[PDB]
Amino acid sequence: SDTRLDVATLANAVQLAARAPSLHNTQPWRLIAEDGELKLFLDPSRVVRSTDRSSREAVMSCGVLLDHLRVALAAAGWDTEVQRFPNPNDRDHLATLSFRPLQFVTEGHRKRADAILARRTDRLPMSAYVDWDAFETLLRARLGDGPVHMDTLGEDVREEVAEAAALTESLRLYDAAYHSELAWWTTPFATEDGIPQTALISAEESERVAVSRDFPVAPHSSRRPALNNDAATIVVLSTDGYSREDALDAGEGLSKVLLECTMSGLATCPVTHVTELHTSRDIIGRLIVRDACPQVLVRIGLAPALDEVPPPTPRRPVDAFLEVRPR
């Protein structure tokens, strides 16, 4: 029996992995534990319909969960093997995971699982990380030979990205659905999902972060007043194409990047609205290497170490999204 992953350990790893980030904290994943395996499905009811064409970011978010689950399970002593899109007749079935014991859990495994708990999205301005170059080498080693590529944008294109962001908001001015979705998923009365007020920034703070999606403003505040402008390094993660398979890959890559950043004490913030429209995404495409499809931007930098840290954003309980089917 000792080579079969047990429910308690699986569920504990799911509880940890569910810290994964997701578009608007929608957590659009469904899991089924059955016959010793774990099936990962998109939850179509939790797709942000106008915002996220083709459910790309919902699938991406599930990819982030996929990688998180692997990380969580490794720290628990379990290796994971993944079959992606195992059922041509159900494109909502994104992956099936199977498990085998590791011989030992490394310090790396532990630190990476600690990073899952520590990571948060930080929408305040950041300082640039002075030892970026050496860190970029670590990030690239983690991403290996694909399927997700990363471009580090030069400071000389920061304004172009900012203007692509503004263009995106302009194109959404009359998209009522986008605006109602943004309101919905930022309602202050949500408790298990959505973006809480403590995770949002004030109008004044927003003036100081050029690369951002506009969200409803939090109550007035002027945090990190020493930083007149965000100086985060901007990286773009991209894939060969824009299929569901590519979306899933993108999310696994995004998870790897966010966790690597967190393990090195770096602040992160994904920015995706510039990838949600053709016009915007093509602008970002021209900033990156030939033939690559931009999937997500990440701001990477330093937060002030003694800043108070907002509380964790909420997650759904595991019994909302994990089914266990008896043998």
Ligand X SMILES: Cc1cc2c(cc1C)N(C[C@H](O)[C@H](O)[C@H](O)COP(=O)(O)O)c1[nH]c(=O)[nH]c(=O)c1N2
* Contact code string over 158-197 relative to ligand X, x by CB under 6 A: -------------------------------------x--
Q: Of 80 and 280, which has the nearer Cβ to ligand X?
A: 280
What the block records as the tokens of 303 is 């937060």
> Judged by CB, which is closer to ligand X: 33, or 148?
148
Residues 6+ apart with CB under 8 A from 137: none
| Residue 320 CB contacts under 8 Å (≥ 6 apart), including other chains | 192
Those residues whose C-beta lies under 8 Å from the C-beta of residue 66, and which sit 6 or more positions away, are: 40, 82, 94, 95, 97, 248, 251, 252, 255
Pairing state of beta strands 149-152 and 233-239?
Answer: antiparallel
- Count H helices and E strands in the chain, helices first: 9, 9
Query: Please, what is the angle between helix 7-17 and helix 107-118, to 10°?
Result: 50
What Rg value do the Cα atoms of the chain yield, rounded?
A: 19
From 39, 120, 158, 208, residue interacting with ligand X (rule: CB under 6 A) = 120
Nearer residue to ligand X within complex by CB, 31 or 250: 250
Closer residue to ligand X in complex, CB, 121/233: 121
Q: Which stretch binds ligand X (CB under 6 A): 42-50, 71-79, 101-109, 119-127?
A: 119-127
Sheet (strand 322-324) strand order: 78-84, 93-101, 37-42, 29-34, 322-324
Nearest residue to ligand X on Cβ basis? 21
Closest approach, Cβ 247 to ligand X, in A, equals: 9
Residues 123-162 that bind ligand X (CB under 6 A): 123
Span from 4-12, 93-101, 167-175, 265-273 in contact with ligand X (CB under 6 A) = 265-273
> Considering the rule CB under 6 A, would residue 55 count as an interface residue with ligand X?
no
Among residues 137 and 197, whose Cβ is nearest to ligand X? Answer: 197
Q: Residue 272 is which amino acid?
A: T
- Per CB under 6 A, contacts with ligand X among 11-40 are 21-25
Binding positions for ligand X, rule: CB under 6 A = 21-25, 57, 60-61, 64, 120-121, 123, 195, 199, 213, 269-273, 296, 313
Binding site per annotation, positions for FMNH2: 119, 121, 123, 213, 272, 313, 315
